[PDB]
Design a protein around this nucleic acid. Structure first.
Lengths: 262, 66, 67, 66, 64, 68, 65, 262, 262, 67, 67, 69, 68, 69, 65
RNA sequence: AAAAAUAACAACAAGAUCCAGCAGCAACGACACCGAACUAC
């Protein structure tokens, strides 16, 4: 059928994920476009055929420093056009955005800074959010349905995090971040893909390095597939397999009934 | 409206309890639900409609950036 | 009018006993009979008419949800 | 001004003894002789010109509709 | 338009004393030497330029 | 659009007449009209004061002035 | 139609002059002008408060400009 | 956990339901409240203990003409108060409405006339709908949420009907009925129960008497658990079992997280 | 007062109509634009001044074969523009569509295949139907207020034909045809003037060749005035003179409030 | 230059094939090209017109035509 | 050249009320007061200069024949 | 560039200082008087010296008629 | 002049590569470039449409082609 | 011959470094300061070096009054 | 005149560019070559954009000549 | 008097007649108005 599968997997360094076997798992896991983010490597590094998969193209945009950030993207067929710019110092200087265009459908690999590294990172995250909300408000005029593979590092509602009573103070769950994420899914009209098909809790996509939280399943949902209201109806299913995890985040696999094309 | 619209939008999205001082001295309290060119909506147990031409000042209860 | 009329017409259709606080601190009570772009009408025994330039606020007695 | 004009015209033709309450608080009494953009000529023994921008409300006194 | 301008013209041509009650509650006396769409001149003892918005009502001193 | 406010203000300025501005609130300010506009008027005092048009009720010159 | 308002307000805001905005109701506000618009202005005496133009009467600068 | 199971069904005559064995199956299925639309019997007829189940109370409103209509309702605990009325002439005459109040929740056994008999029936149905729109616009103010377990006899979207191209002129699917349903479920905000728990097709509740349609699965969805937006979040599961057919329609069990109490 | 008139006379061969004196009947019938369908002759044949009514213009587009198709159009005044063809092989190669634009209005003459001759005819009818609904969907957003006063050879509702149950298998009332017509009408917002001015039954235009069928009034309504919902407000009345019955079709005449002009 | 435009338009005029000229604004004119010239083309249809070259975008011959 | 100048001269001498449609799709009206190799003065209660590089077409309200 | 109509018309509009209105290809309407014009530029006066290009102008209508040489 | 336009257009023509042209109005035509001169291009599509150079904006090939 | 009035105006706008607008035919509102203008291009100097074509410009509105030499 | 050195520099350093046509749409990419009327823009696909249809050419990063 | 810019609509016969109901507001903006200019709610 006209199924379209998209996989968003944050690796926190493509080297570790490739060592754990993310390359082979992706090559085996059938999909159309892999929104893998947080490469932490320059374009000359991704160009290495070791990372390049068979039957999947490669695109990448890195910051001035390879480890400072960067985001990559795979695709089954050659997209109509790829663009590695957003227009913000917090986005271009860090290489946190890359968009690929198919017939009236654009997939973007968004990457927000974690913020837990320090206060400066939190300020940069707030600035990036305040600029991205404006970018979205400006993009509401276009007719193309957008599929942002976002690693927002922000939990929306209570179900998106366990033991919220204790997480109300830790970064990634404060009041302004929650308000921004609700405005994105609220007034602007956008809607999350995962929360559309499965309105149940415990579906987390991130856990600290300590295995205690993993055993207790104390995690957040720092991965979203933001869809224009036009694509909200085409959301068939979503899944967050935790066992085949190659980093702190878990692969988020969303399948639609939409059929992309060159 | 280069400052009115963004300011009101920031006060709305964050749900900041604002205090609107009218012209006749009395002040109303509540968060901005929605606003227009000539009407603002205050939610404070009763969704009331205040008029722009009657408001004097709008002070946020907590600081807000721009 | 993007948010003014959708509220006044809703109050009219729903017949909510609204209280209008003018700019000079005086309060009026009643239902909106037929609001216009300049003047609103009340549904009291006298059917008073209040201009929309001397009205400060319009608070309904029961919470009205925008359609 | 879809209903303002016909309402004022009906109050004028019938010579209704309206009561115009201004914004400052003082009230004026007298039938409406004529009206126009930002002006109402209230004539009842003595003629007066009340500006609409200063009028707050107009109680028709008698139950009169359009 | 059809009332304000002709009424002010009649008040001026007749030189009738005109009491202009402001929205603040003050009673200004004098004749309308001239009038504009935003300001009205009330000269009798000292020159004055009363703004239109600040005028609540304008009553003549005798029939017009 | 007006043709009587601009010349009156220009005269009150160039003749440098001690002007008294009474606002709708019910107060008094004194000084000379240094500059005018469609929505503001600068008044000279110990500190130049920008008075808005919509708030001004009357502008009385301390001495009678003739129109141009 | 603001050849006199906009430059004055811009100078007062850039120079960071503690101005006092006397409203129409008789209240005396204070604080520095942060950013002004065609229908609203912003002050920061203690917090970023928006004052509506139609409610302002005069703007007395604490220092001659 | 607090599982409140509501079982709505159209008996199309309590006699046929009792003959086919609706009572036993209904008693077997654990449920807090059961709505029986179209009883076609007087209140005195329902007085027979044959219809009275153990652990359930007997409530019913009979039409002026017993054969023309009638509704029933059983609950596990004595409701706060029964409101066997609506206000309109059609409802009061045909007893097509009966309500039971609970803690911040009230269940209504709505029944719109099918309109499949003739033209007068279609006109009565149009009048009933043009009056129920006003009724719902009035009830939109009160705080307590409502659960209308009603056989609206009107399909909403294509997902509710197969071969919609053929039924474009059959009563219960014309343009005005579709518009009224879309307005009641969109403009007013009364979100449906099925379209929020399972956004899949083929979920039919009605089947013509012809066995051909039954074998071919040609069916329409007429039953509806209309929920106030306040209760939408309290939906969990809703599946239509067709194998226990006891009338022209089939039950519509729906489980909610809300828990009722006197 | 302001009034316009339009006539639709599917001559089914201008030769047969002229043989029955239809030219004089049309000349006597005062009208602004006459849209006769099925000329069954080339443009050179229509150039004969016999068919040219004094005071009325002559336009015509002939199919690749005379008897195959062909359409004509008469206007009391010189139209601003006259066009033919729609890009489809079922229309251009047969000239089954001829449009004329005056000002603020555009009147078109359309001739759909009867589909009653053979299976290939019905297949071409389905092709023309789908291509034409596609084109019309592409024309909805345009400014021109189109009036496709044309013969569709398809009955929409039961009101357009008695004993519809027997006509279920006969062409013109087939399920897919009725569904296509209902989609062209409602889904896209188009309506018909004749039904709008009067929702009365027993009014038909087409009749079989059998005499007893016409005696007992067994006819279909195949000629329609597909009219954009914008100008529907200016429709006055519509008639169906069943007295002549000169040809298989009837002279569907409709008067509107709007007035055309060069 | 302009070595192909001449024969194409010449043949379209000789055969009098109904052509549809789509302009730059998106509007479409329909009719027979009566006379082609530099910087201007003459149309033929009820109420003929004179279309300018710099405003034309495409010329669809509608029916097959060879060069 | 061969077709533009004679056509325009005929339209001007005969004083035919033509309608000039611009490149944006706007419709103009008036009689051809004068023409040039770059602009056209069209009169209709006011002499407007329309640039030839902004004229989509010219529709003569009266049939005209070439010389 | 060889025209015999635009030059005198524009020179008359400039010397006479007639209120002119320029409608551009985009459909925007500018209003003012001409200061100086060339084969590719026109300087309009209306609180600013506005250099409007020629190719971007669609029509030029004066507020009142003018005589030609 | 046109040192780079022809080597590309004639190349697309010879290989008959399906290309999509984008008119200045904003829409998109599709097809193979049949013939082209210094003023117009021809699309080999069924309609055999002709497009004007000045009205064209871009020519996106369906597949990458080598520059001669 | 083709820039008798455009060349000095643009040169003055560039020298004075006055905020220019440079409206495009589409109706967009550009801005910056003309750094160097040639026959068919204008290099606007703003936050980032920009290049705008001549045939796509429709208006050059300087924010401050300028006098031609 | 300046267009030639400008495009030569944008092509030498291989700077990501953004072209903006008359209709108003934006085309990101990287200049491959430029002639008197045509410019080759390569971004997954190689397309030929016309000079007369281009309105602006913004380099993604600051560049002079 | 001008969307710091729609990765692009197989194309606009054409824009100058009553809440099955809140463990309840130290109290309703202090009630529907109670006719020569004086600068903190």
């Amino acid at each position: 059928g006209p199924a379209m599968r998209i996989i968003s997997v944050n690796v926190n360094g493509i080297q570790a994920a490739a060592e754990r076997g993310l390359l082979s798992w992706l090559q085996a896991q059938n999909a159309d476009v892999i929104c893998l983010q947080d490469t932490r490597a320059s374009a000359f590094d991704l160009d290495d055929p070791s990372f390049q998969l068979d039957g999947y193209f490669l695109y990448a945009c890195d910051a001035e420093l390879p480890e400072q950030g960067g985001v990559a993207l795979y695709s089954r067929l050659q997209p109509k056009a790829v663009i590695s710019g957003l227009g913000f110092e917090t986005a271009d200087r860090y290489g946190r955005y890359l968009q690929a265009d198919f017939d009236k459908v654009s997939i973007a690999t968004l990457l927000l800074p974690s913020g837990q590294s320090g206060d400066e990172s939190l300020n940069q995250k707030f600035k990036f959010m305040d600029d991205f909300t404006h970018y979205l408000s400006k993009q509401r005029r276009k007719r193309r349905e957008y599929i942002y593979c976002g690693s927002l590092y922000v939990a929306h509602q209570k179900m998106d995090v366990k033991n919220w009573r204790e997480c109300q103070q830790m970064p990634g769950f404060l009041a302004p971040e929650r308000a921004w994420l609700d405005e994105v899914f609220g007034n602007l009209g956008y809607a999350d893909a995962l929360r559309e098909v499965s309105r149940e809790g415990d579906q987390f996509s991130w856990w600290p390095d300590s295995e205690q939280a993993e055993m207790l399943n104390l995690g957040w949902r720092f991965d979203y597939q933001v869809l224009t209201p036009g694509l909200r109806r085409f959301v068939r299913n979503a899944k967050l397999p935790r066992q085949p995890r190659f980093s702190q985040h878990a692969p988020l696999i969303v399948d639609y009934d939409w059929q992309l094309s060159i | 409206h280069s400052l009115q619209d963004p300011y009101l939008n920031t006060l709305r999205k964050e749900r900041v309890p604002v205090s609107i001082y009218l012209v006749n001295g009395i002040k109303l309290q509540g968060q901005i639900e929605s606003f227009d060119q000539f009407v603002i909506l205050l939610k404070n147990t009763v969704s009331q409609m205040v008029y722009k031409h009657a408001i004097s000042t709008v002070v946020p209860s907590r600081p807000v950036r721009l």
